Amino acid sequence: QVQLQESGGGLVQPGGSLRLSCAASGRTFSSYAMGWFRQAPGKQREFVAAIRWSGGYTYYTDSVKGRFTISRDTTVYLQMNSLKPEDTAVYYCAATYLSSDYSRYALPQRPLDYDYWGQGTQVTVS
């Protein structure tokens, strides 16, 4: 099990850039994955990006591909470039230990596929 804490939240102006961080406390192995989800006003919690801690497989939702980069250092980062007002949302860090039979180069995208969650942090592009 891991405990998760986001940082880097806050305001940024349109056309700027912002980096979120999430520090994981606990054992970060055995098909361990981390992800970012976000929830905009009036919307569901949506998948943003995820990463496999071993091997480095990543996947991005279509609307952020090429603009956002997810990476490792203990800590996962979401580097957010060319920010638009529509990127405004509460961003949540998530993590999970995938089942033993999982492909080593695969990631789930549904919120309930991730067992561990941060409290979320507001990002406002305005």
Side-chain angles (χ1 to χ4, degrees), residues 2 4-24 26-42 44-45 47-64 66-99 101-126:
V2 292
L4 305 176
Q5 182 61 59
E6 300 91 343
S7 64
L11 176 79
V12 60
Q13 285 154 303
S17 72
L18 185 152
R19 187 198 74 165
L20 293 173
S21 295
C22 175
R27 295 160 304 174
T28 55
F29 48 89
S30 281
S31 301
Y32 182 71
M34 297 196 76
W36 290 95
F37 289 77
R38 76 183 171 185
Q39 183 166 43
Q44 45 163 9
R45 293 197 193 194
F47 180 84
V48 178
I51 187 163
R52 292 294 294 265
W53 223 244
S54 185
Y57 179 75
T58 60
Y59 183 84
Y60 299 87
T61 193
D62 283 345
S63 72
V64 309
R67 287 194 304 123
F68 289 16
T69 302
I70 193 172
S71 67
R72 293 209 292 164
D73 63 337
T74 86
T75 300
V76 68
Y77 304 95
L78 189 64
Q79 177 63 51
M80 302 154 68
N81 300 338
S82 307
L83 280 161
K84 41 188 77 170
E86 50 265 50
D87 286 318
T88 296
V90 177
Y91 284 73
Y92 296 90
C93 172
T96 215
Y97 301 105
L98 299 163
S99 63
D101 58 338
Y102 235 83
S103 163
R104 286 189 67 78
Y105 294 89
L107 285 158
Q109 293 171 36
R110 300 173 299 186
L112 293 171
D113 295 335
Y114 290 78
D115 291 329
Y116 310 103
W117 288 82
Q119 288 307 305
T121 193
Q122 183 73 55
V123 169
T124 302
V125 189
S126 181

